[PDB]
């Protein structure tokens, strides 16, 4: 029996409880785990996003209905991300200003997958019209309904819960931790040690066999998940695991963030995250129930925690004297290998990018699953170690790419700051993307319908940044195919049908304006 027979966590929050609880249902009762974590001084709640897939993916394998958790953690609605002044000059402003052509700086990047026509994507078709003048409409409001529905502040489901579009969430990212770790002591048999770390005991070859605590007690185990954040206490110092940084791609490298009182009732609630553009970096606005958090990233290189924090308390008129802000400094990029022998780091302690489009909770999620899956024996196969690692560095790298393209091809040049991020290199694998994009072709085209896409982790995991998604963001920006694809001009009858389907979509948009709740009733609903 070379069997793993127990599972030490190092720290708490999402990372360590997430992974707690989601190996403690993979291991069905098989294999001891223990999480040992810091006690802290509970930090104010400065909002955290997600994706789709979270319930299905996460919470529907553990068996927590989506309602039970949600009512918990104060948890509000996302039906995107939305994109304000990455075109335009200037200060920040929670207000859009305008372009040259007239059009608000605003756009946005929904969920869902799109419809297409003779196995041509809606977006395409949408691009043919743009590019000859025959349409003024904007792709995010071409091509999803949900735009329409964000723009008057509905709800993503009814009142009775009928489901209108695709969603994911807001919530308190301490609260989630809360609410998990609660789990998985009670229904899960997971022991919690509230301690500090102080040595990493290791064998011959450089394997963990222990963490002592600062109490003295000795954890032994046999894997080691390395949930220790930035500091990487096992993989990064223990194990002497490189991490690369990659700041020669993205150049945010720290964040002021606080949680803001909202009037609810007077204002509504915005079902999407806003990515406020600043003179150094960009803001985000995640509505809660109650308050929205917000947080300015920013890159120090650029600008002074005072400047930072000045300038953000200023969007949002607060007194810097009189508001309490948790300031963050971070590691962007990711180690060399996110499992070296028999320490699995997940989290921060992994990788991180800014929360640009979403990536922290996803991250965790991806890691976990894969660890799952490739969950070792004592032998810790080569083989199997190498390919979790694969799927790390390909996760990760791809999300970075993307992230780096918002600031590539962002028009901006009117700060230090803009200026510099057109002096980055883009890495070859984005370069190839924008070539495809550039002539007309779709980029990661989707094979599958949406139950498929959000139904089976692994579909989403192997197309992740989709078509539509690359639409909305080289689109959203300003940069355009260099023409149509050149198919279309040989399909007067694919033209025809796709025609059809943008009315399709200013109906649906149309008349689920008219009869959904508003996001705000949604949640008095919700949280009654
Ligand atoms: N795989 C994600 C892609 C996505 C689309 N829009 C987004 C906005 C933010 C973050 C991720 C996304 C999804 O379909 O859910
Ligand atoms: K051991």
Same mark, same amino acid.
């Given at each position: 029996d070379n069997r793993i027979k127990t599972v030490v966590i190092l720290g708490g929050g999402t990372a360590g409880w997430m992974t707690a609880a989601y190996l403690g249902k993979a291991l069905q009762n098989t294999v001891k785990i223990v999480v040992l974590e810091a006690?802290?001084?509970?930090? @104010?709640?400065?909002? #955290?996003?997600?994706?789709?897939?979270?319930?299905?993916?996460?919470?529907?394998?553990?068996?927590? /209905?989506?309602?039970?958790? *949600?009512?918990?953690?104060?948890?509000?609605?996302?039906?995107? !991300? %939305?994109?304000?002044? +990455?075109?335009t000059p200037g200060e920040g402003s929670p207000d859009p200003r305008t372009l040259d052509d007239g059009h608000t700086d605003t756009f946005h990047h929904p969920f869902?997958?799109?419809?297409?026509?003779?196995?041509?994507?809606?977006?395409?078709?949408?691009?043919?019209?743009?590019?000859?003048? $025959?349409?003024?409409?904007?792709?995010?409001?071409?091509?999803?309904?949900?735009?329409? @529905?964000?723009?008057?502040? %509905?709800?993503?489901?009814?009142?009775?819960? &009928?489901?209108?579009?695709?969603?994911? +969430?807001?919530?308190?990212?301490?609260?989630?931790?809360?609410?998990?770790?609660?789990?998985? !002591?009670?229904?899960?048999?997971? #022991?919690?040690?509230?301690?500090? *770390?102080?040595? !990493?005991?290791?064998? #011959?070859?450089?394997?963990?066999?222990?963490?002592?605590?600062?109490?003295?007690?000795?954890?032994?185990?046999?894997?080691?998940?390395?949930?220790?954040?930035? &500091?990487?206490?096992?993989?990064?110092?223990?194990?002497? $695991? /490189?991490?690369?940084?990659?700041?020669?791609?993205?150049?945010?490298?720290?964040?002021?963030?606080?949680? !803001?009182?909202?009037?609810?009732?007077?204002?509504?609630? #915005?079902?999407?995250?806003?990515?406020?553009?600043? $003179?150094?970096? +960009?803001? +985000?606005? @995640?509505?809660?129930?109650?308050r929205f958090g917000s947080g300015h990233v920013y890159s120090d290189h650029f600008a002074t925690q005072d400047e930072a924090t000045l300038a953000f308390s200023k969007l949002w008129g607060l007194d810097p004297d009189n508001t309490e802000f948790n300031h963050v400094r971070f590691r962007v990029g990711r180690n060399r290998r996110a499992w070296v022998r028999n320490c699995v780091s997940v989290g921060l302690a992994s990788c991180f990018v800014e929360p640009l489009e979403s990536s922290g909770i996803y991250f965790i999620y991806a890691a976990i699953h894969m660890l799952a899956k490739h969950f070792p024996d004592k032998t810790f196969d080569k083989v199997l170690v190498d390919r979790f690692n694969r799927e790390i560095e390909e996760m990760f790298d791809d999300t970075r790419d993307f992230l780096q393209a918002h600031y590539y091809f962002s028009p901006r040049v009117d700060t230090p700051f803009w200026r510099a991020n057109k002096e980055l290199k883009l890495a070859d694998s984005i370069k190839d993307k924008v070539e495809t994009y550039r002539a007309g072709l779709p980029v990661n085209l989707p094979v599958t319908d949406e139950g498929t896409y959000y139904g089976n982790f692994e579909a989403e995991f192997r197309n992740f940044w989709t078509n539509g998604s690359y639409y909305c963001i080289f689109a959203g920006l300003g940069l355009m195919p260099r023409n149509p694809l050149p198919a279309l001009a040989y399909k007067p009858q694919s033209i025809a049908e796709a025609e059809l389907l943008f009315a399709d979509v200013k109906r649906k948009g149309d008349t689920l304006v008219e009869s959904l709740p508003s996001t705000y009733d949604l949640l008095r609903q919700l949280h009654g």
């Amino acid at each position: 029996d070379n069997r793993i027979k127990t599972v030490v966590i190092l720290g708490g929050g999402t990372a360590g409880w997430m992974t707690a609880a989601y190996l403690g249902k993979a291991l069905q009762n098989t294999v001891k785990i223990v999480v040992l974590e810091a006690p802290t001084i509970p930090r @104010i709640g400065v909002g #955290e996003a997600t994706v789709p897939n979270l319930q299905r993916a996460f919470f529907d394998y553990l068996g927590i /209905p989506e309602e039970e958790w *949600m009512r918990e953690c104060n948890a509000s609605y996302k039906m995107a !991300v %939305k994109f304000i002044n +990455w075109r335009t000059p200037g200060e920040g402003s929670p207000d859009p200003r305008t372009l040259d052509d007239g059009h608000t700086d605003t756009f946005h990047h929904p969920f869902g997958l799109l419809p297409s026509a003779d196995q041509i994507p809606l977006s395409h078709y949408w691009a043919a019209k743009r590019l000859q003048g $025959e349409t003024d409409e904007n792709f995010d409001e071409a091509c999803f309904a949900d735009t329409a @529905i964000m723009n008057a502040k %509905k709800a993503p489901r009814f009142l009775d819960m &009928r489901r209108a579009t695709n969603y994911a +969430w807001h919530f308190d990212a301490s609260k989630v931790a809360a609410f998990l770790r609660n789990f998985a !002591v009670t229904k899960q048999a997971v #022991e919690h040690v509230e301690d500090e *770390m102080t040595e !990493v005991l290791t064998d #011959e070859r450089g394997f963990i066999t222990a963490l002592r605590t600062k109490s003295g007690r000795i954890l032994q185990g046999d894997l080691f998940v390395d949930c220790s954040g930035f &500091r990487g206490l096992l993989i990064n110092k223990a194990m002497e $695991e /490189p991490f690369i940084d990659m700041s020669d791609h993205l150049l945010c490298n720290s964040a002021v963030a606080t949680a !803001v009182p909202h009037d609810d009732e007077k204002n509504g609630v #915005e079902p999407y995250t806003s990515s406020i553009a600043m $003179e150094a970096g +960009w803001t +985000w606005k @995640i509505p809660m129930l109650g308050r929205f958090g917000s947080g300015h990233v920013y890159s120090d290189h650029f600008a002074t925690q005072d400047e930072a924090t000045l300038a953000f308390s200023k969007l949002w008129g607060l007194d810097p004297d009189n508001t309490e802000f948790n300031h963050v400094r971070f590691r962007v990029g990711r180690n060399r290998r996110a499992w070296v022998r028999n320490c699995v780091s997940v989290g921060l302690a992994s990788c991180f990018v800014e929360p640009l489009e979403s990536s922290g909770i996803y991250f965790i999620y991806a890691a976990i699953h894969m660890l799952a899956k490739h969950f070792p024996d004592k032998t810790f196969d080569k083989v199997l170690v190498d390919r979790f690692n694969r799927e790390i560095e390909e996760m990760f790298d791809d999300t970075r790419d993307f992230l780096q393209a918002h600031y590539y091809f962002s028009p901006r040049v009117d700060t230090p700051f803009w200026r510099a991020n057109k002096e980055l290199k883009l890495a070859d694998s984005i370069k190839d993307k924008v070539e495809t994009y550039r002539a007309g072709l779709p980029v990661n085209l989707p094979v599958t319908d949406e139950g498929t896409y959000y139904g089976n982790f692994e579909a989403e995991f192997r197309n992740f940044w989709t078509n539509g998604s690359y639409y909305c963001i080289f689109a959203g920006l300003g940069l355009m195919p260099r023409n149509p694809l050149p198919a279309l001009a040989y399909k007067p009858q694919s033209i025809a049908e796709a025609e059809l389907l943008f009315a399709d979509v200013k109906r649906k948009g149309d008349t689920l304006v008219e009869s959904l709740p508003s996001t705000y009733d949604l949640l008095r609903q919700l949280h009654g």
